[PDB]
């Protein structure tokens, strides 16, 4: 037997959990001495175990090939190898427990000083190593770690020396554990969380288990704080000053009155549990969780989960998320009305839990387990059902539960994610129910729900959710399991996939959540895009995604699928989501006399809010103020009268003058997560502008050799298109039916016998390559010697027989231009046996000058499509051209403003104004073909023109990248259509 490295590889292929570690326990704030070893370490990378040197480097002397590296780190974020993104696919051959030969081996070393306070007893703590670590101290092997997002501690008593010590950690990227860590995210090896030296004084406390229930009938707290040392219960004193409590650890007491903890009102009581040699500081939130009548209840009430799935990602540091970024993003979530977080799909940094307790989120704390890439072989060799993996998988769940069991914010334990069904998941569930019966068990991966307490699905359609909400979904084959599941409350652990332009269809889910008590709510997939900052040639910065780092196998931009970008800048989807889940409903009376107010919170009344009104018109604000609202109880409603001035202003409005009344609920005072005046909810009533009246056609057509003139518009006699409007140069005018595919349009819709993505259906149909034939140009009798001009055209694509006849009828009184567009199908829009859907029915104006400013009356400020835009409110908006765009990582259709009544483009010295019945407005400095061709933002280039899109109809954007496509009501099937616009140019 002559091959090198067999012992190292045999360890990496082990099914066992780590070796040599102390018992799993809680992460506890203690007064015991501690020393963080975070900082600059020395690092050496080898390409595999068989060539990783056995050169005594653990002793730290004469190190050849080492360089400095910050720890904690994801080491491919610092030039060592490269990030690699796969979704489901494993990046190595599926032969568990075997590892590939190409397996980055990172040797880590740091020298540190240990003072006398770490003797006789201390330990070393590692809060995360991806995926397999071997640890030596002063050349002595302490043990190994498995479970990349889990904590390990090693006793160093009698190995640590007073004074200088050398810590050495060999980290393998891949191991047998990789087979159970197949989350959809970047593969990033490293020592990516804290390394800590902790003294273990005699007569100390190793573990604590807080039990703090709430009796919602009596208002009492039920408190018991367990404390142990070496796995044995110990004498300790628990003190809770604010509740006047001094009690023994280990005894259950009834606190006469406590204020209960919820995400809405995250009341925490400071406490300490003390033994002779060590004191632990705790924050106690009293709350009880119960499943009753097919509802998930906290403190006696059904709650609504307004959730997101939170991965840990940083665009420059990988899995290392700085604390200030964590604090800021949780405040951002609260500021967008989120009340719940799922830790997809592993425990977070241990510091996250106290922030969730404090700011207030319902947390689904999920174990580090995912075997998704076994699905493609029918789950053959799945670790979840393989007896050899039982100890490893129970260990993951044990470490998960033990670390975070004291936190009020944790309201469910999750076994893992997309790991199939199997006996080891049952073992993990049984262990958890025995250890901590206070929290229900979640696991979507087994739809029978045999070993869980809630029925969880991901991306179930709105239709299926409505059936589940009514308790009428199809039965399981097993009657006993069906009865159990039908009595469970239902949660969407992932829904309304937020990739690219979208997500559409959020309102339809939310209406069901509000209607059906069995529905717990849902967690958007996902909070953040995992973009990785990259540099172009001129040092331009942009986000990269799958395949941008040389991966042989990858899943492209599927890692950029979030409500916020990697730097936590909101995508439009977050602005819409904030509105969808707003915790108050404000319905403003049509006559502006008042508003109906429903408090949708579960526990809090409306006393935290100030209720403000404003009336706005073309010239700005006309009236505004605040109104007193007696506190509305949770789940109750009332009618609030507005001051008489408001309705009087509505009564005096001249007909056709637009005006908007907005009623807003804002924070009356600073909270922990935002300042006074922060907006939480709103409602509006709009007095719409009258339809624009088309101008009298009193100008005639002036005919020249090659041009025609009709008031302010010049036409080409060869094309029939305008070449200038009031001096503004027009390079092209034509019909649009297509847009640059969104991420959703690139996904298959599994619903019918056509599984081509919409984008492919469009390409096959030629919708991206329309051409127009001129049929004729004629002038017609207008008014008082005036003439209208009708240009007849037909739009089709090469090699297709279907088309649309498009007639433009132009009229002018000399200042205002009337444009009537009529579209008529000529032949059936069917291609490859399937009917062709359209993205829109609209016009593209290509103008020969650049636009500096875009203003409009309609919905804003951000984009809106038929099935999105909930956060776009009625008003007057004005933006520089650049701010009309949306910086999605892969450029795609975006930036449309649906519901526009008027628009004004400032092209240098002129202003082009458009009016009509509702239209969507888009303005870009590059063409649709440039947008579609661009894979990253630097691929976009301005060409000196303005591309102006005026759409009479748009389709929805849906969530077809993962989950439901566009709902039926928002699909755009070929039809005949006609629409009127007016245009005019101002200097």
Ligand X SMILES: OC[C@H]1O[C@@](CO)(O[C@H]2O[C@H](CO)[C@@H](O)[C@H](O)[C@H]2O)[C@@H](O)[C@@H]1O
Please give the residues from 364 up to 383 whose contact with ligand X meets the rule CB under 6 A.
375, 379
968 binds, among ligand X, Na ion, a second copy, none (CB under 5 to 8 A by kind): none
What character string, x for contact with Na ion (CB under 5 A) and - otherwise, covers 540-559? Answer: ------------------x-
Instruction: Tell me how far, at minimum, the Cβ of 412 lies from ligand X, in Å.
Output: 16
**Closest to 932 in 3D by CA, of 758, 769, 744, 741:** 741
Report the SS3 class of residue 735. Answer: strand
* Residue 748 contact, options Na ion, a second copy, ligand X, none, Cβ 5-8 Å cut-off depending on partner type: none
Comparison of 48 and 76: residue with beta carbon closer to a second copy: 48
| Contact string 514-543 vs Na ion (x = CB under 5 A) | -----x------------------------
Nearer to ligand X among residue 418 and residue 906 (C-beta): 418
Any idea of the CA torsion for 417, 418, 423, 427, to the nearest 10 degrees? Answer: 0
How open is the CA angle 238-241-244, to the nearest 5 degrees?
90
247 neighbors 238 (Cβ within 8 angstroms): yes
Q: Which is nearer to ligand X, 82 or 481 (CB)?
A: 481
Q: Which is nearer to a second copy, 800 or 945 (CB)?
A: 800
Residue 355 main-chain phi, psi, to 5 deg:
-65, -40
The least CB distance from residue 395 to ligand X, in Å, is 21
Whichever of 536 and 828 has its CB closer to a second copy, that residue is 828
DSSP string covering 540-563, please?
A: -EEEE-TTTT--SS--GGGG---S
**Cα-Cα-Cα-Cα dihedral sign, residues 925, 927, 930, 931:** positive
445 binds, among a second copy, Na ion, ligand X, none (CB under 5 to 8 A by kind): ligand X
The CB-of-551 to a second copy minimum distance in angstroms stands at 10
Cβ 356 to ligand X, closest distance in Å? 15
Select from 8, 127, 153, 184 the one that contacts Na ion (CB under 5 A).
184
Residue 254 and residue 217: Cα distance in Å, rounded? Answer: 13
561 counts as binding Na ion under rule CB under 5 A? yes
Q: Determine whether 705 is exposed, middle or buried from the number of CB atoms within 10 Å of its CB (0-12, 13-18, 19+).
A: exposed
State the binding partner of 558 from Na ion, ligand X, a second copy, none, CB within 5 to 8 A by kind. Na ion
Q: Which does 51 bind (CB under 5 to 8 A by kind): a second copy, ligand X, Na ion, none?
A: a second copy
Helix (H/G/I), strand (E/B), else coil: 221:
strand
- Using CA atoms of 923, 926, 929, 934 in order, give the dihedral in degrees to the nearest 10: -110
Q: Which is nearer to ligand X, 331 or 748 (CB)?
A: 331
Nearer to a second copy, 257 or 798 (CB): 798
Toward a second copy, which CB reaches closer, 102 or 691? 102
> CB nearest ligand X: which residue?
445
Q: Which one of ligand X, Na ion, a second copy, none interacts with residue 335, CB within 5 to 8 A by kind? A: ligand X
Question: How far from 62 is each of 55, 69, 715, 946, CA to CA, in Å?
Answer: 10, 18, 82, 64
CB nearer ligand X, residue 78 or residue 678 = 678
Of 423, 368, 414, the residue nearest 390 (C-alpha):
423
> Which residues neighbour 614 within 8 Å (Cβ) at sequence distance 6 or greater?
621, 623, 624, 661, 662, 664
How many CB atoms neighbour CB 254 within 10 A? 12
| Binding footprint of a second copy on the chain (CB under 8 A) | 1-6, 48, 50-51, 86, 88-95, 98, 100-102, 373, 376-377, 380-381, 552-553, 701, 703, 706, 708, 717-720, 769, 771-774, 776-779, 794, 796-801, 803
- Tell me which residue has tokens 């004729």: 776
Q: Cβ 447 to ligand X, closest distance in Å?
A: 4
The nearer residue to ligand X, 458 or 728, going by C-beta atoms, is 458
Q: Is 335 in the site for ligand X (CB under 6 A)?
A: yes
Cβ of residue 417: shortest distance to ligand X, in angstroms?
Answer: 7
Q: Which does 95 bind (CB under 5 to 8 A by kind): Na ion, a second copy, ligand X, none?
A: a second copy
72 prior amide bond cis, ω within 30: yes
Q: Which does 418 bind (CB under 5 to 8 A by kind): ligand X, a second copy, Na ion, none?
A: ligand X
- Compare residues 404 and 582 and give the one whose CB is closer to ligand X: 582
- The gap between the terminal CA atoms of the chain, to the nearest Å, is 88
> Which is nearer to a second copy, 2 or 257 (by Cβ)?
2
By beta-carbon proximity to Na ion, the closer residue of 184 and 194 is 184
Shortest distance in whole angstroms from residue 17 CB to a second copy: 24
Among a second copy, ligand X, Na ion, none, the one that 472 touches (CB under a kind-dependent 5 to 8 A) is none
- The correct pick among 61, 324, 434, 628 for binding Na ion (CB under 5 A) is 628
Q: Looking at beta carbons only, is 440 or 445 nearer to ligand X?
A: 445
Nearest to 140 by CA among 119, 117, 173, 167: 167
Task: Provide the minimum distance between the beta carbon of 712 and a second copy in the complex, in angstroms, as a whole number.
Answer: 18
β-sheet bridge partners, residue 410: 363
Contact 730/724 with Cβ under 8 angstroms?
yes
| Partner touching 61 among ligand X, a second copy, Na ion, none, CB below 5 to 8 Å by kind | none
Query: Site mask, ligand X, residues 942-971, x = CB under 6 A?
Result: ------------------------------
Asked whether the beta carbons of 762 and 738 are under 8 A apart, the reply is yes
Q: Residue 309 interacts with ligand X (CB under 6 A)?
A: no
Q: How far is CA 565 from CA 499, 544, 746, in A?
A: 11, 12, 20
- To the nearest whole angstrom, how small is the minimum distance from the Cβ of residue 324 to ligand X? 9
- Rounded CA separation 738/955 (Å): 10
Residue list 394-453, contact with ligand X (CB under 6 A): 418-421, 444-447
Site for ligand X, residues 645 to 704, rule: CB under 6 A? 673-675, 678
Q: Distances in Å between the alpha carbon of 839 and those of 623, 738, 801, 963?
A: 41, 5, 19, 19
Contact 108/169 with Cβ under 8 angstroms? yes
Q: How far is the CB of 637 from Na ion (least distance, A)?
A: 17
To a second copy, the closest distance from the beta carbon of 667 in angstroms equals 49
In this structure, the strands spanning 455-458 and 490-495 are parallel
The least CB distance from residue 575 to ligand X, in Å, is 11
Cis peptide before 97 (omega within 30 of 0): yes
State the number of binding residues for Na ion (CB under 5 A).
5
Do the Cβ atoms of 957 and 867 come closer than 8 Å? yes
Q: How many residues bind ligand X (CB under 6 A)?
A: 18
Q: Give the one entry of ligand X, Na ion, a second copy, none that residue 718 binds, where binding means its C-beta sits below a cut-off of 5 to 8 angstroms depending on kind.
A: a second copy
Q: 122-160 in b/e burial notation, b at 16+ Cβ within 10 A?
A: bbbbbbbbbbbbbbbbbeeebbbbbbbbbbbbbbbeebb
Maximum C-alpha span of the chain:
107
Residue corresponding to tokens 């427990």: 97
Output 30 or 788, the one with its CB closest to a second copy: 788
DSSP state of 370: B
- Closest approach, Cβ 879 to ligand X, in A, equals 17
Helix ranges (H only) for 815-933 are 928-933
Please report how close the Cβ of residue 279 comes to Na ion at its closest, in angstroms: 43
Least separation in angstroms between CB 105 and ligand X: 32
Cα–Cα dist 435/430, whole Å: 9
- Are residues 730 and 721 in contact, defined by beta-carbon separation less than 8 angstroms? yes
- Give me the residues that bind ligand X (CB under 6 A), please: 328, 331, 335, 375, 379, 418-421, 444-447, 458, 673-675, 678
Q: Which chain residues interact with Na ion by CB under 5 A?
A: 184, 519, 558, 561, 628
């Amino acid at each position: 037997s002559l091959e090198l490295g067999a012992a190292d590889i045999q360890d990496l292929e082990s099914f066992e959990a780590g070796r040599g570690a102390l018992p799993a326990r809680a992460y506890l704030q203690s007064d015991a001495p501690r020393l963080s070893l975070n900082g600059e370490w020395q690092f050496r990378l080898s390409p595999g175990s068989r060539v990783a040197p056995d050169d005594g480097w653990q002793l730290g002397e004469a190190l050849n090939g080492f360089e400095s590296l910050p720890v904690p780190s994801s080491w491919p974020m610092h030039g060592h190898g490269a990030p690699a993104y796969t979704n489901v696919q494993f990046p190595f051959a599926v032969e568990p427990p075997h590892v590939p030969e190409a397996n980055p081996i990172g040797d880590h070393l740091v020298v540190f000083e240990a003072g006398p306070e770490f003797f006789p007893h201390a330990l070393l703590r590692f809060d995360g190593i991806e995926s397999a670590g071997t640890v030596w101290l002063n050349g002595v092997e302490l043990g190994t770690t498995r479970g990349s997002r889990l904590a390990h501690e090693f006793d160093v008593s009698g190995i640590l020396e007073q004074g200088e010590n050398t810590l050495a950690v060999r980290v393998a990227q891949f191991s047998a554990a990789s087979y159970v860590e197949d989350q959809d995210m970047w593969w990033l090896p490293g020592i990516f969380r804290d390394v800590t030296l902790q003294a273990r004084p005699a007569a100390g406390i190793d573990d604590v288990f807080v039990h703090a229930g709430y009796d919602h009938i009596t208002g009492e707290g039920i408190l018991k704080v367990e404390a142990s040392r070496g796995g044995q219960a110990i004498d300790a004193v628990v003190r809770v000053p604010e509740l006047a409590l001094e009690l023994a650890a280990g005894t259950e007491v009834r606190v006469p009155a406590v204020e209960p903890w919820s995400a809405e009102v995250p009341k925490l009581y400071e406490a300490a549990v003390s033994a002779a040699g060590e004191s632990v500081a705790l924050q106690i939130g009293f709350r009880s969780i119960a499943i009753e009548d097919a509802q998930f209840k906290v403190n006696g009430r059904r709650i609504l989960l307004r959730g997101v799935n939170r991965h840990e990602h940083h665009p420059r540091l990988g899995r290392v998320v700085p604390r200030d970024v964590v604090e800021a993003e949780l405040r951002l979530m609260k500021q967008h009305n989120i009340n719940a977080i799922r830790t997809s799909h592993y425990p977070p940094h241990p510091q996250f839990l106290a922030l969730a307790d404090q700011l207030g989120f319902y947390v689904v704390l999920e174990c580090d387990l995912e075997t998704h890439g076994f699905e493609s072989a029918g789950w053959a060799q799945n670790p979840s059902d393989d007896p050899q993996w039982e100890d490893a998988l129970v260990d993951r769940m044990r470490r998960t539960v033990e670390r975070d069991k004291n936190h009020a914010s944790v309201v469910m334990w999750s076994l893992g994610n997309q790991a199939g069904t199997g006996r080891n998941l049952a073992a993990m569930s049984r262990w958890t129910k025995d250890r901590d019966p206070s929290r229900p068990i979640h696991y979507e991966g087994d739809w029978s729900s045999e070993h869980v307490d809630v029925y969880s699905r991901m991306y179930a359609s709105q239709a299926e959710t409505a059936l589940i909400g009514q308790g009428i979904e199809p039965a399981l084959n097993d009657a006993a399991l069906d009865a159990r599941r039908r009595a469970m409350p239902f949660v969407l652990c992932e829904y309304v996939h937020a990739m690219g332009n979208g997500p559409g269809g959020m309102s339809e889910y939310q209406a069901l959540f509000e209607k059906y008590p069995r529905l717990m709510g849902g967690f958007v997939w996902e909070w953040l895009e995992h973009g990785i900052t990259v540099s172009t040639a001129d040092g331009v910065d942009h986000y990269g995604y799958g395949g941008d780092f040389g991966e042989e196998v990858h899943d492209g931009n599927f890692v950029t699928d979030g409500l916020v970008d990697a730097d936590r800048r909101p995508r439009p989807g977050l602005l819409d989501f904030k509105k969808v889940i707003e915790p108050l409903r404000i319905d403003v009376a049509r006559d502006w006399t008042g508003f109906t107010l429903r408090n949708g919170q579960d526990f809090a009344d409306t006393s935290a809010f100030s209720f403000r009104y404003e009336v706005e018109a073309d010239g700005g604000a006309l009236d505004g103020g605040t109104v007193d609202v007696a506190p509305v109880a949770p789940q109750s409603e009332t009618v609030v009268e507005l001051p008489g001035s408001v309705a009087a202003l509505a009564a005096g409005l001249s007909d056709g003058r637009p005006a908007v009344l907005t009623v807003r609920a804002v924070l009356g005072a600073d909270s922990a997560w935002a300042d006074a005046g922060h907006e939480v909810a709103w409602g509006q009533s709009v007095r719409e502008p009258g339809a624009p009246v088309p101008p009298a056609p009193v100008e005639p057509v002036q005919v020249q050799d090659s041009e025609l003139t009709l008031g302010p518009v010049v036409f080409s006699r060869a094309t029939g298109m305008p070449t200038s409007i009031g001096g503004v140069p027009v390079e092209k005018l034509g019909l649009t039916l297509w847009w640059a595919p969104t991420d959703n349009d690139l996904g298959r819709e599994w619903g019918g016998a056509d599984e081509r993505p919409l984008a492919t259906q469009w390409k096959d149909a030629g919708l991206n390559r329309l051409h127009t034939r001129l049929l004729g140009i004629s002038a017609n009798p207008g008014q008082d010697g005036g003439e209208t001009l009708t240009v007849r055209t037909r739009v089709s694509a090469a090699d297709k027989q279907y088309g649309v006849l498009v007639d433009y009828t132009w009229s002018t009184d000399g200042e205002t231009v009337g444009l009537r567009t009529q579209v008529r199908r000529d032949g059936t829009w069917v291609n490859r046996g399937f009917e062709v859907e359209w993205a829109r029915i609209g016009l593209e104006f290509v103008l020969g000058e650049e636009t500096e400013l875009v203003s409009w009356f309609g919905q804003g400020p951000h984009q809106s499509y038929p099935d999105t835009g909930q956060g776009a409110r009625a008003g007057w908006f004005s933006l520089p051209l650049a701010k009309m765009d949306v910086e999605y990582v892969r450029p795609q259709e975006c930036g449309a403003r649906s519901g526009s009544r008027s628009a004004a483009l400032q092209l240098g010295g002129r202003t082009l104004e458009i009016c009509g019945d509702p239209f969507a407005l888009t303005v870009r400095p590059y063409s649709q073909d440039v947008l579609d061709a661009a894979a990253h933002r630097p691929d976009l280039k301005a060409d000196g023109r303005t591309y102006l899109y005026v759409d009479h109809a748009l389709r929805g954007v849906g969530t077809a990248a993962c989950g439901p496509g566009v709902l039926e009501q928002y699909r755009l099937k070929p039809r005949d259509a006609d629409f009127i616009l007016t245009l005019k140019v101002r200097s």
